[PDB]
Homo-oligomer: A and B are copies of this chain.
Amino acid sequence: SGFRKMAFPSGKVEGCMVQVTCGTTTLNGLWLDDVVYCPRHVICTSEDMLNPNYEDLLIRKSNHNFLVQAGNVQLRVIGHSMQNCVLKLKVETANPKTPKYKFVRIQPGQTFSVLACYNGSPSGVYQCAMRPNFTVKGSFLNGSCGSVGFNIDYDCVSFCYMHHMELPTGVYAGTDLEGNFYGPFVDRQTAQAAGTDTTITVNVLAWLYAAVINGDRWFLNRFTTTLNDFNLVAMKYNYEPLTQDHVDILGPLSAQTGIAVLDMCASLKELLQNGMNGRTILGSALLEDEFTPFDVVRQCSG
């Protein structure tokens, strides 16, 4: 037995993190080849953030209004340009630590690692999920902005998230590395509703498989259910509906444990209806939804 929330090793991302300063605002930037990527709101004053015209604000700014440090190395900004909500600062020097990378837009319920940074220096790494309502439940203090989320696939760093905003309701929102927000959010200090979150049903089932593999079996019961029966119970408890694609994705875990996916759904159903009766599963007293089936396979097979 043994199963923890695991982040990807952060070394490949650490050598890409820089410090971006505009006026009283300093936050984080991502230096890949000759381009530093950061939130375009670095160019805003506390005042501007209320109702920014980023076209007109970006026109008033000059190269030299951007102060980009990497440890010591002051990097010289030789151009500035806007892609949706991300600022691209062109610099004189191509990062010699630039890993093999792609930019990807992930789906809701997928996980990624965040390298949490303050003034362009890495502080910590943690594992996150994209909530179904396209928010992130994270740790971002006041200069955490422009910190990035990522996955490592074979030899390639897949950058999927850049941190932009804390919402007045104390949740986080941000963009892909092309500057398109996840969810309905805008880079403006206004009231913005996240709307109803749900629990990532396929993740909870992945985690129940993780629990069986690590010896935790009390919640296995003598029932199956159909997808319809289950989804009627899911909808009552604000669980995401389960699709046949979800059942297909859980197949290997099914095969490893000899427990059919609908058998495990019948377990989940009872846990939703009667709670845990004061017991725990993998040392937790609530149902965990921030492990994907892929995360559980990786950790339960190396």
Contacts and interface: CB of A to CB of B under 8 A. Distances in A.
A143 interface: yes
B286 A7 contact: no
B137 A283 contact: yes
A258 interface: no
A43 to B, nearest CB: 23
Interface string A10-41: 11101100000000000000000000000000
Contact of A139 (B3, B12, B137, B286): B3
A79 to B, nearest CB: 29
Nearest to A169: B1
Interface stretch (A117-125, A217-225, A233-241): A117-125
A140 interface: yes
Identify whether the interface residues of A are mostly helix, strand, loop, or mixed.
Answer: loop
A11 B285 CA distance: 34
A2 interface: yes
A5 B283 contact: no
Interface residues of A, number: 43
Contact of A2 (B7, B172, B215, B302): B172
B126 A302 contact: no
A214 B122 CA distance: 22
A139 B302 contact: no
Interface in A265-302: 280, 283-286, 298-302
A7 B116 CA distance: 10
Contact of A118 (B137, B286, B302): B302
A138 interface: yes
A124 B172 contact: no
A170 B11 contact: no
A15 B9 CA distance: 11
Nearest to A299: B139
A141 interface: yes
Contacts of A10: 9-11, 125
Contacts of A299: 124, 139, 141
A123 B298 contact: yes
A8 interface: yes
Contacts of A123: 6, 9, 298, 302
Nearest to A280: B286
A140 B3 CA distance: 9
A68 interface: no
Nearest to A140: B2
A10 B6 CA distance: 12
Given A5-B126, A9-B11, 7 more contacts: A2-B139, A5-B5, A6-B126, A7-B126, A9-B122, A141-B301, A170-B214
Interface of A: 1-12, 14-15, 115-116, 118, 122-126, 137-141, 143, 166, 170, 172, 214-215, 280, 283-286, 298-302
